[PDB]
Design a protein around this ligand. Sequence first.
Ligand SMILES: CCCCCCCCCCCCCCCCCC(=O)OC[C@H](COP(=O)(O)OCCN)OC(=O)CCCCCCCCCCCCCCCCC
Ligand SMILES: CCCCCCCCCCCCCCCCCC(=O)OC[C@H](COP(=O)(O)OCCN)OC(=O)CCCCCCCCCCCCCCCCC
Ligand SMILES: CCCCCCCCCCCCO[C@@H]1O[C@H](CO)[C@@H](O[C@H]2O[C@H](CO)[C@@H](O)[C@H](O)[C@H]2O)[C@H](O)[C@H]1O
Ligand SMILES: CCCCCCCCCCCCO[C@@H]1O[C@H](CO)[C@@H](O[C@H]2O[C@H](CO)[C@@H](O)[C@H](O)[C@H]2O)[C@H](O)[C@H]1O
Ligand SMILES: CCCCCCCCCCCCO[C@@H]1O[C@H](CO)[C@@H](O[C@H]2O[C@H](CO)[C@@H](O)[C@H](O)[C@H]2O)[C@H](O)[C@H]1O
Ligand SMILES: CCCCCCCCCCCCO[C@@H]1O[C@H](CO)[C@@H](O[C@H]2O[C@H](CO)[C@@H](O)[C@H](O)[C@H]2O)[C@H](O)[C@H]1O
Lengths: 115, 98, 318, 174, 171, 347, 97, 96, 82
Amino acid sequence: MNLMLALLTNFTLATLLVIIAFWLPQLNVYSEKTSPYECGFDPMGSARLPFSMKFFLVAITFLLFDLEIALLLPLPWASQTANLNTMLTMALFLIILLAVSLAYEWTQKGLEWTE
Amino acid sequence: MSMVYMNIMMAFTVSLVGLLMYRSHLMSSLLCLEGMMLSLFVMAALTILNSHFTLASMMPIILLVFAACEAALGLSLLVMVSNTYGTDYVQNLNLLQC
Amino acid sequence: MFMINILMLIIPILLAVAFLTLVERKVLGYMQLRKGPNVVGPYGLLQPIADAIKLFIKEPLRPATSSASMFILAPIMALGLALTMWIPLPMPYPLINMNLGVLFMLAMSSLAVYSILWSGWASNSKYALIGALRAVAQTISYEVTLAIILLSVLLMSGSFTLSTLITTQEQMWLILPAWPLAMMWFISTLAETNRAPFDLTEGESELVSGFNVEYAAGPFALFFMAEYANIIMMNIFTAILFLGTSHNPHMPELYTINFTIKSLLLTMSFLWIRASYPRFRYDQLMHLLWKNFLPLTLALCMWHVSLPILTSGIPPQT
Amino acid sequence: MMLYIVFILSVIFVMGFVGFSSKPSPIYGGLGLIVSGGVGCGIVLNFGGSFLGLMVFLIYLGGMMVVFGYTTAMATEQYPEIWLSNKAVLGAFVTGLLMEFFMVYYVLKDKEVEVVFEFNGLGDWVIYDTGDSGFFSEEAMGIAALYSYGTWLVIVTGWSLLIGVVVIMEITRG
Amino acid sequence: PGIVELPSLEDLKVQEVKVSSSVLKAAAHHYGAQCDKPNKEFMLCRWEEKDPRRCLEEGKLVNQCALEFFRQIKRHCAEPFTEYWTCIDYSGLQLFRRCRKQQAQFDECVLDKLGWVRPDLGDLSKVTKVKTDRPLPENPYHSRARPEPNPEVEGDLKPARHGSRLFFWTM
Amino acid sequence: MNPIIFIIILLTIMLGTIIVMISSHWLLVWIGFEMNMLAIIPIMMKNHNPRATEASTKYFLTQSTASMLLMMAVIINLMFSGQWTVMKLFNPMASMLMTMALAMKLGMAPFHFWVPEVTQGIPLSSGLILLTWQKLAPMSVLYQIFPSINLNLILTLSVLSILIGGWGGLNQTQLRKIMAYSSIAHMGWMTAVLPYNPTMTLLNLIIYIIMTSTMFTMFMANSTTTTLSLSHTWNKTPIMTVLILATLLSMGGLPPLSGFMPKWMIIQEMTKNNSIILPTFMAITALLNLYFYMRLTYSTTLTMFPSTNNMKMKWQFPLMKKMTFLPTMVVLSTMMLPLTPMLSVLE
Amino acid sequence: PFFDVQKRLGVDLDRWMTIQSAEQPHKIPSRCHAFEKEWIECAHGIGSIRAEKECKIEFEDFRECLLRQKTMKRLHAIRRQREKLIKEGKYTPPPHH
Amino acid sequence: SMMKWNRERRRLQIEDFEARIALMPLLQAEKDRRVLQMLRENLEEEATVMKDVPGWKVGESVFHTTRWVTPMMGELYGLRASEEVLSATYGFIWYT
Amino acid sequence: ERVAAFLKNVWAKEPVLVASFAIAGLAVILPTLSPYTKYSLMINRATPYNYPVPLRDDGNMPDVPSHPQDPQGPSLEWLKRL
Ligand SMILES: CCCCCCCCCCCCCCCCCC(=O)OC[C@H](COP(=O)(O)OCCN)OC(=O)CCCCCCCCCCCCCCCCC
Ligand SMILES: CCCCCCCCCCCCCCCCCC(=O)OC[C@H](COP(=O)(O)OCCN)OC(=O)CCCCCCCCCCCCCCCCC
Ligand SMILES: CCCCCCCCCCCCO[C@@H]1O[C@H](CO)[C@@H](O[C@H]2O[C@H](CO)[C@@H](O)[C@H](O)[C@H]2O)[C@H](O)[C@H]1O
Ligand SMILES: CCCCCCCCCCCCO[C@@H]1O[C@H](CO)[C@@H](O[C@H]2O[C@H](CO)[C@@H](O)[C@H](O)[C@H]2O)[C@H](O)[C@H]1O
Ligand SMILES: CCCCCCCCCCCCO[C@@H]1O[C@H](CO)[C@@H](O[C@H]2O[C@H](CO)[C@@H](O)[C@H](O)[C@H]2O)[C@H](O)[C@H]1O
Ligand SMILES: CCCCCCCCCCCCO[C@@H]1O[C@H](CO)[C@@H](O[C@H]2O[C@H](CO)[C@@H](O)[C@H](O)[C@H]2O)[C@H](O)[C@H]1O
């Protein structure tokens, strides 16, 4: 309960601030005021046009690397095992294969952005 | 069964239908694949946690790992599809009818 | 009595955030051979109040091309999540005592990124979009290294509980056995908080205002309050992790004073760093983390798994 | 009302699934998957799996961040579709909610429901264990055993993740 | 499928040991030594019998020994003990290490007045043997009779009669 | 692709298949399929052209969908039995989902649509792996779960696969699409007999793999992928046209060739169980396969098609392709009928 | 397994996690440990065809432990009969309940 | 420094764990009586509510085996105020 | 000689990677040389998460103690001295 009460209070406080922000000030809305900003001149083309991602390969690698830490975060608990010979070997094994995969992507120029 | 299973099984079915009923964007279907795995994770976690199957508690974690390998694989193909045609539309992938 | 405790957490947070804006402008000013706000109230003490009132009576704008619901949602998420980050903090007693407080903080930090992505995307303007996609790159740069840095430290604490870090550091600050990780952690928090020299998602001199360029008045203030709240919260986290304050159960306020001083100085260091350095290029930030911190962080993670086992100093699970 | 916490979260779980399954713009589909991942973490946490719940939320937040980036690059159009903008998307969205709302309405009315298969609606707490007093988390013991019992699992997962990097490099080298 | 046999509310009656966990924790180490015998006879019973209904009598002797143990403390060392568990109760985690001074006062009191020696580190986690006059249960799981195994095939392996015998093949 | 990377990826394709065949745990069976799917995709994309990209995408979407249905069955099985052992399933809904999941992995009808397209879109060497090695893992699972499979479901899939495979190949001029529809037709025989005698499913599987490997190796030897391109073989290497003729007649099931052996042993097992109508229907429908095998033999060996002038340049160069095991495989594809009683080795 | 290399080599790859009554960390038992043990020992060695009928009692109890469908039916019936008497004014719960 | 401190922290954990081991017999004995008492009360009030039901037999098992089976939450707290049910089911998880 | 020539070059060009490999090597190597590693497993074994279920004294278990303070059974004197 304490947790749900705390989250509700925070996000309700934020919502009230927005409600006041919109209903308290005097408004004067017209077309030019609400037009998209681009340093004084009208934009050329929609902002919804495709925006090329030059780090796309690092982004996919992040998915694989971000799952590795899910496998590693239990390590503080795994260190309480009596079978420490196996646990230490498999912990080091997993991290090394992460390093090998990093070294492969590095040496193969996967970490350089497409130009 | 317990009522929670009604909504988790329902969520899996919704995503399965979402996967099988394509629209245009290939990214939208890849999302339905990720949703299907999320329902399987939750459905498996409930069973394992409720039955106190201690060693099975690692199984949902292993499920996520191969979920990411699938998502990464799906995104890799999306990049190539996008490079070829300039969209991720699935109607462009019709060369192999002939 | 719990509701009172909640208010005695978030009202002070927002007041501390408001006066951190004054402190930054004065600290930057004197480092720049000038004074900073000293006219609005004595020594500029009313300046944050003036700015806050100004913004919330300013006209808020909904851009013609914006996605209305997401435009409103993002600032609400930003501030809401920023305040949520504070509830497990042990000062010395957390508002919410969590078994996995560190993991909770990681998850909530990841969710707060979406307030940048959605505000920028919902603005439907090019500078806003460019800012949001810089946040995608920034998150990809630091997130993996940030989690593994914490893991290496927690292999000495033995748990994911924030209060255990106090017990761990009762004899000695963790900064001693893990200053290489402290170095890399400290930089990661600058990137995590979008702070100079990693102020890229806003990047004023490049993107005008980046992800929040279309935001005005109260909605803009919510983003400002969020970022400055996260800057303070991340330095409290740094103080707990690496500069553990001793806790006397019968004089809990001595802990609070000592811990508050440490957190303030770490926050002053953020302003100091902003005054000193040029900005990174956002591809150079990604190469910093992946090509320097990550190889070192992986190696140190291996070391901090082995070291407790080889020295027979594994911490208690409880 | 609080005794039905898992049920309420599971209702929102399905609503998030209907969200992205109707397939609006992937920007909003990602939003629906984040909500479902968030409440899904809440469901698993309420069964005693705090680590599993927080982990799935953390992973899916990272995954949807990448999907967002790829969307603005490769899955965007001039007028991205919300649920109301498209007739096919709206029909699927409404159909999902109505199927969901009727399952909820009838399972609550009868404390039971037949939706193909029989589900009991007494509340989810009834199946819980009654006697816990250990000095550890059973989920944490089970997960940590991956490094002592799961040697074979560690090898195949670690190998698959390494091969995964090798493969995505091959797949995307035109 | 049968009626679950439950003891009557009368049979479940015993004088409870109504003290808080801080009191129990403060006296735990001495209680572990002084009440070892009935305690270990109850725990053998529960693990062998696998039925709370089958160990009620042993459960009561655990309670009776506890009350007798706490009455000795009350008679002889009330004030030193009340100081000790009061210190334990303050801690949110009920930590021993915050009350070594009060623990020493309590420990020396019970030692002088009752000859009670505190168990060493590792003593109370030892697996001990206990002598009991209760008979070892025969079918604690209430197992049915196991199905008989398939009749074993034994003998001398001889060549197949006329080979494979597949259609026309002669070998 | 670096040669070392190609070998590591190939060994991972095999490791995933091996894991499925040696696992006693449903989770490791699922991991084996996932590892196999991850490794094969780069083999499909090896040449990097739009058709390879389309093929790999269609393959990924199909296999990934099947795995989710596969894991759904495993979790439902866990709810209703509380174990993970690879064996009969303890819930009929789980059995259906797993059975469909394996049908999509094999490309059985009516889940067959991907097989012709994917096979056409990838090279011949990759097509060989897809239509041979990739059948092992799903069949090894069916071999262990068949006591709980719904008979009507599995025989329906087998019937539809034989019909759709036979009809589908009649309209094809592309060799890779001819092999694809042939594979669908042969998958049906393997599953049709599975409820009655799993040993005959292995026999058909092994003989199908030998014959299918032989054909692909001969197509690779001459770099032929269409009917007309293959019709020039009589002018380059006459011997290869005779091997193709013998192998194709074998795949048609004609005595006294080896390919008759599985059709013969499957009909025996089905009749022992009083199944008369189904084997009769299956044997007659397999005549469709013989028809479009016979067309290839006509255009390849039993007539001489027009040639081109530039073909004379090829007369002056030898075959350089590895053609690994082709002499052994072709003999096994054709001359094995006298040794039929050796099928007991698979028992 | 299709190929039993684990048995041939006497190496345990995955069967440690196949059943919930196998050895767990710190000897934490599953909730249905006794039921599954009884079923496994009843059906050991006789084959599924025999075990499907000769160990039906053990499997049914094990199934009841796992999913508790019969218990939830029983409790749903009692709770229904209580609301029947509450509205009809024919039963007052006790203080302790 | 961390090695020495973590060694002492491990010796403290053992002392804390052993105090629990000393008290577990008494706690176990209390839990058994309490569980049996709650089940007995549930049985008394089952008879009254379900006296009129045609085919009902009070206290019938769902299990063929006569072995003791640990009750699940609904079995033990099935007929009690939500405040007590909510505390017994979600009290631990929801405690800060 | 090449041992130092290569090492000096990487120290000048990529000291970060030199430090990474040196630290990783020590993690793999030192655990097998340390004399204190054996106590890590003993301490984990001596931690009693579970109840120590007593054994039915059957009349011939001399190595087992009757009371927790009896001389038999494992001791932690080594742990107090660590
Ligand atoms: C054993 C018990 C089990 C029974 C099963 C049946 C066993 C038979 C299995 C056969 C296995 C395939 C191997 C057949 C070997 C054929 C040898 C041959 O055809 O001669 C080679 C010759 C190739 O030409 P070349 O190498 O260049 O020599 C100089 C001529 N240019 O060839 C040519 O030049 C011919 C080119 C013209 C094409 C004529 C095609 C009609 C003749 C086909 C006869 C073979 C039919 C095999 C089918 C099965 C028969 C039962
Ligand atoms: C294949 C030759 C026929 C060619 C025409 C094709 C006919 C149709 C083929 C379909 C299969 C029908 C085969 C019918 C015979 C199989 C049944 C059979 O023969 O009995 C089993 C046979 C042992 O024969 P058995 O009666 O015991 O006589 C022993 C004589 N020493 O054991 C066997 O099964 C193996 C016998 C197979 C028959 C061929 C092998 C005979 C040995 C000669 C091999 C060649 C040796 C010379 C090598 C020359 C090298 C250049
Ligand atoms: C790409 C693949 C990379 C694979 C890399 C694998 C690296 C593995 C390096 C070995 C890691 C473990 O190294 C090994 O750890 C165990 C315990 O932890 C040590 O064992 C030592 O402590 C344990 C208890 O802690 C005692 O049982 C043992 O008697 C004692 O020798 C070994 O002395 C050490 O050799
Ligand atoms: C066990 C974990 C700790 C061990 C370290 C694991 C990570 C190893 C990282 C890769 C090591 C070898 O792989 C890497 O190859 C590339 C070649 O393009 C080199 O990179 C080269 O170009 C890049 C960009 O200009 C720069 O890093 C550098 O100027 C240069 O060395 C790296 O110097 C080398 O580190
Ligand atoms: C591609 C499809 C996507 C949707 C997937 C949905 C999966 C949902 C899985 C639910 C599984 C329910 O499984 C079903 O449960 C009921 C329980 O009453 C069983 O019910 C049957 O068996 C049990 C005992 O064996 C008894 O109730 C009774 O004999 C009979 O009703 C069914 O034999 C079983 O098939
Ligand atoms: C963005 C949209 C989100 C939609 C979310 C939809 C949530 C689903 C609604 C679930 C509502 C559950 O509703 C819950 O039902 C049970 C029925 O026994 C009620 O519980 C009831 O039990 C006893 C019965 O003896 C009554 O005396 C009591 O008055 C009543 O509380 C709860 O008071 C109610 O809260």
